Design an enzyme around this catalytic site. Sequence first.
Site, PDB file in Angstrom:
ATOM      1  N   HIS A  23      33.297  12.360   9.359  1.00 16.70           N
ATOM      2  CA  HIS A  23      32.772  11.245   8.569  1.00 16.70           C
ATOM      3  C   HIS A  23      33.479  11.155   7.223  1.00 16.70           C
ATOM      4  O   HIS A  23      33.727  10.056   6.714  1.00 16.70           O
ATOM      5  CB  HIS A  23      31.263  11.436   8.375  1.00 16.70           C
ATOM      6  CG  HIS A  23      30.636  10.516   7.365  1.00 16.70           C
ATOM      7  ND1 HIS A  23      30.218   9.239   7.675  1.00 16.70           N
ATOM      8  CD2 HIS A  23      30.312  10.708   6.063  1.00 16.70           C
ATOM      9  CE1 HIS A  23      29.678   8.680   6.604  1.00 16.70           C
ATOM     10  NE2 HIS A  23      29.726   9.549   5.610  1.00 16.70           N
TER      11      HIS A  23
ATOM     12  N   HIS B 291      29.410  11.446  -0.893  1.00 16.42           N
ATOM     13  CA  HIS B 291      28.799  10.129  -0.976  1.00 16.42           C
ATOM     14  C   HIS B 291      27.457  10.193  -1.708  1.00 16.42           C
ATOM     15  O   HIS B 291      26.788  11.227  -1.750  1.00 16.42           O
ATOM     16  CB  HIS B 291      28.602   9.535   0.425  1.00 16.42           C
ATOM     17  CG  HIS B 291      29.871   9.084   1.073  1.00 16.42           C
ATOM     18  ND1 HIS B 291      29.975   8.870   2.431  1.00 16.42           N
ATOM     19  CD2 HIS B 291      31.087   8.789   0.549  1.00 16.42           C
ATOM     20  CE1 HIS B 291      31.201   8.461   2.716  1.00 16.42           C
ATOM     21  NE2 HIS B 291      31.895   8.404   1.591  1.00 16.42           N
TER      22      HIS B 291
ATOM     23  N   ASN C 179      30.283   3.310   8.956  1.00 15.19           N
ATOM     24  CA  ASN C 179      31.275   3.240   7.897  1.00 15.19           C
ATOM     25  C   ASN C 179      32.326   4.323   8.113  1.00 15.19           C
ATOM     26  O   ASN C 179      32.003   5.516   8.116  1.00 15.19           O
ATOM     27  CB  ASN C 179      30.618   3.396   6.536  1.00 15.19           C
ATOM     28  CG  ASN C 179      31.588   3.123   5.419  1.00 15.19           C
ATOM     29  OD1 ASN C 179      32.521   3.887   5.208  1.00 15.19           O
ATOM     30  ND2 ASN C 179      31.402   2.011   4.723  1.00 15.19           N
TER      31      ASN C 179
ATOM     32  N   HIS D  18      28.474  16.255   1.434  1.00 12.05           N
ATOM     33  CA  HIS D  18      29.733  15.590   1.114  1.00 12.05           C
ATOM     34  C   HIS D  18      29.492  14.738  -0.131  1.00 12.05           C
ATOM     35  O   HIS D  18      28.431  14.813  -0.755  1.00 12.05           O
ATOM     36  CB  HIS D  18      30.314  14.807   2.313  1.00 12.05           C
ATOM     37  CG  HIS D  18      29.518  13.614   2.760  1.00 12.05           C
ATOM     38  ND1 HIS D  18      28.406  13.714   3.568  1.00 12.05           N
ATOM     39  CD2 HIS D  18      29.725  12.287   2.577  1.00 12.05           C
ATOM     40  CE1 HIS D  18      27.938  12.506   3.825  1.00 12.05           C
ATOM     41  NE2 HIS D  18      28.726  11.621   3.244  1.00 12.05           N
TER      42      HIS D  18
ATOM     43  N   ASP E 126      24.533   9.215  -1.022  1.00 12.49           N
ATOM     44  CA  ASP E 126      23.328   9.648  -0.320  1.00 12.49           C
ATOM     45  C   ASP E 126      23.209  11.168  -0.268  1.00 12.49           C
ATOM     46  O   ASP E 126      22.137  11.674   0.089  1.00 12.49           O
ATOM     47  CB  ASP E 126      23.246   9.031   1.093  1.00 12.49           C
ATOM     48  CG  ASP E 126      24.435   9.372   1.997  1.00 12.49           C
ATOM     49  OD1 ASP E 126      25.588   9.335   1.524  1.00 12.49           O
ATOM     50  OD2 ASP E 126      24.218   9.628   3.209  1.00 12.49           O
TER      51      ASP E 126
HETATM   52  C1  LIG Z   1      26.780   2.234   4.251  1.00 12.59           C
HETATM   53  C2  LIG Z   1      25.590   2.562   4.706  1.00 12.59           C
HETATM   54  C3  LIG Z   1      24.720   3.574   3.952  1.00 12.59           C
HETATM   55  C4  LIG Z   1      24.858   4.943   4.434  1.00 12.59           C
HETATM   56  C5  LIG Z   1      24.586   4.929   6.014  1.00 12.59           C
HETATM   57  C6  LIG Z   1      23.488   4.648   6.814  1.00 12.59           C
HETATM   58  C7  LIG Z   1      23.604   4.698   8.200  1.00 12.59           C
HETATM   59  C8  LIG Z   1      24.833   5.025   8.772  1.00 12.59           C
HETATM   60  C9  LIG Z   1      25.917   5.314   7.953  1.00 12.59           C
HETATM   61  C10 LIG Z   1      27.277   5.625   8.529  1.00 12.59           C
HETATM   62  O1  LIG Z   1      27.727   6.790   8.624  1.00 12.59           O
HETATM   63  O2  LIG Z   1      27.950   4.609   8.870  1.00 12.59           O
HETATM   64  C11 LIG Z   1      25.819   5.262   6.582  1.00 12.59           C
HETATM   65  C12 LIG Z   1      26.747   5.484   5.495  1.00 12.59           C
HETATM   66  O3  LIG Z   1      27.893   5.790   5.667  1.00 12.59           O
HETATM   67  N1  LIG Z   1      26.233   5.328   4.255  1.00 12.59           N
HETATM   68  C13 LIG Z   1      26.865   5.477   2.970  1.00 12.59           C
HETATM   69  C14 LIG Z   1      26.081   5.935   1.922  1.00 12.59           C
HETATM   70  C15 LIG Z   1      26.635   6.084   0.667  1.00 12.59           C
HETATM   71  C16 LIG Z   1      27.969   5.774   0.469  1.00 12.59           C
HETATM   72  C17 LIG Z   1      28.751   5.317   1.518  1.00 12.59           C
HETATM   73  O4  LIG Z   1      30.088   5.008   1.260  1.00 12.59           O
HETATM   74  C18 LIG Z   1      30.993   5.108   2.320  1.00 12.59           C
HETATM   75  C19 LIG Z   1      28.197   5.158   2.781  1.00 12.59           C
HETATM   76 ZN   LIG Z   2      25.368   9.400   4.878  1.00 16.36          ZN
HETATM   77 ZN   LIG Z   3      28.677   9.622   3.840  1.00 18.23          ZN
END
Ligand SMILES: C=CC[C@H]1c2cccc(C(=O)O)c2C(=O)N1c1cccc(OC)c1
Ligand SMILES: [Zn+2]
Ligand SMILES: [Zn+2]
Length: 230
Positions: free
Chosen positions: A147, A84, A178, A82, A86
């Site tokens: 997600h 994001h 998140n 996706h 990461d």
């Molecule tokens: C914010 C935490 C970093 C990472 C992470 C670590 C552990 C759990 C989760 C989760 O799904 O809640 C997440 C998650 O969403 N991440 C994420 C990474 C990049 C961008 C982003 O923007 C929304 C969010």
């Molecule tokens: Zn992630």
């Molecule tokens: Zn994500």
Amino acid sequence: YPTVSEIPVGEVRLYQIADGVWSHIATQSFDGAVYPSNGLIVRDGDELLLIDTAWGAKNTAALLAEIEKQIGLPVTRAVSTHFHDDRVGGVDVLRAAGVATYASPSTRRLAEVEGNEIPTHSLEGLSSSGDAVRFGPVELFYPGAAHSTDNLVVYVPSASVLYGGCAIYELSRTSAGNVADADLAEWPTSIERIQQHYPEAQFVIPGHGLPGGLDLLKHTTNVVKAHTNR
Ligand SMILES: C=CC[C@H]1c2cccc(C(=O)O)c2C(=O)N1c1cccc(OC)c1
Ligand SMILES: [Zn+2]
Ligand SMILES: [Zn+2]
């Protein structure tokens, strides 16, 4: 399995799940706290298929160096699951290293709008929930929105490894994380599609945290539904 406290930011660990299948684990700072993050590596003959970056340019360079050290086969293609950071952060490093980078048109569009790095090639045939396409030694599956609206999951049929990405939570998590980009109402239905499509999965890898078995799927539904109820 490596934890965030055991991986300094900038280092990458590899972990054999099964023959010719590794996870890669990295750590990154986000809004003032450090998080672990998983991707996948799948042997593709004498080449390697990479699933997701290691969350940043420097982590992803470290990822390539660790793959060369531990495996010693070239990464030739990468798929981001996706938009994001990461998942796509480090795509520019990959492209400059000669890796062909791929993502769905949805992921590429959302990454561009967000100011994130953009995979080069578009993965067609995945825009309808339940869609499945073959990509080298894996199957790519769009379960529906969860997600994020664009999130893909990856199955390795040779190893019965189901990579859920960030649509799947680890068992230690009891609260939703998140949800800014999530579709909470559709997320359980999307997990149900995964469960029905890959009932023989032996290993399930979440986007963040410890891998487990098929229970990670029902567990994620439980957490998301409890968040909605509340
Ligand atoms: C914010 C935490 C970093 C990472 C992470 C670590 C552990 C759990 C989760 C989760 O799904 O809640 C997440 C998650 O969403 N991440 C994420 C990474 C990049 C961008 C982003 O923007 C929304 C969010
Ligand atoms: Zn992630
Ligand atoms: Zn994500």
